[PDB]
RNA sequence: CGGACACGGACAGGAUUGACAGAUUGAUAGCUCUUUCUCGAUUCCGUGGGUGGUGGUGCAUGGCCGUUCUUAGUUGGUGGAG
């Protein structure tokens, strides 16, 4: 439970992402992105087959989560506030990590890759 | 758009920029249109809003200048006249 809860959220503050309706699946076209994350609630079953057709054949792995509404408070557009509303953004299916830039808590995402998923 | 900012919706399962071809036009303005890529949450729309103005009004004014006015005039205080 260490991989999905805490070691990746620190790699989501100010990195390079794929954010919105004209770029949810734009950053998959980049040969510059490391370990990404993917949501298991797509409306059509081939759009996730569309995006794993990039990564899983290649050197890139996805992490499953539930959906792109629990992912909304992670992507960067803050919707919840002291004087705010609960749901003013609906997040992406798949945001990628192109560069960590530092090594605070990144030893477990790379341990997530080649411990059992090899 | 060079209409800041504030309000909600449209913004991640397809908001907003740009652009070659061509019948497009005054025009190598992608203006529009057919076709179709790119840009990355910056925005666009709705509503209140500043804003800019060689737009009005010099009879609402400030500054300035012009003039009788380049001729020798103007004024209190303090007493006196009323
Ligand atoms: Zn008029």
- Whether the Cβ atoms of residue A108 and residue A7 lie closer than 8 Å to each other: yes
Nearest nucleotide to A95 by CA–C1' distance? B12
Q: Would you put residue A20 in left (φ > 0), alpha (ψ -120 to 50) or beta? A: left
For this PDB entry, the determination method is: cryo-EM
Strand B: list positions under 7 Å from protein Cβ: 8-9, 11-16, 39-41
Resolution stated for this PDB structure, in Å: 3.9
- Whether the Cβ atoms of residue A42 and residue A66 lie closer than 8 Å to each other: no
CA of A73 to the centre of ligand 1 (A): 55
Q: How far apart are CA A34 and CA A93, in angstroms?
A: 16
Residue the block writes with tokens 């499953």: A64
- Cα A104 to Cα A6, A8, A10, A13, A55, distances in angstroms: 11, 10, 8, 13, 25
């Amino acid at each position: 439970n260490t991989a999905l809860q805490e070691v990746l959220k620190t790699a989501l503050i100010h990195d390079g992402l794929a954010r919105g309706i004209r770029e949810a699946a734009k950053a998959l076209d980049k040969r510059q992105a490391h370990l990404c994350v993917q949501a298991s609630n797509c409306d059509e079953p081939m759009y996730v087959k569309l995006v794993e057709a990039l990564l899983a054949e290649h050197q890139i792995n996805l992490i499953k989560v539930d959906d792109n509404k629990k992912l909304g408070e992670w992507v960067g557009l803050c919707k919840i506030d002291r004087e705010g509303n609960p749901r003013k953004v609906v997040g992406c299916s798949c945001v990628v990590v192109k560069d960590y830039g530092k090594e605070s808590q990144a030893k477990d995402v790379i341990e997530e890759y080649f411990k059992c998923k090899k």
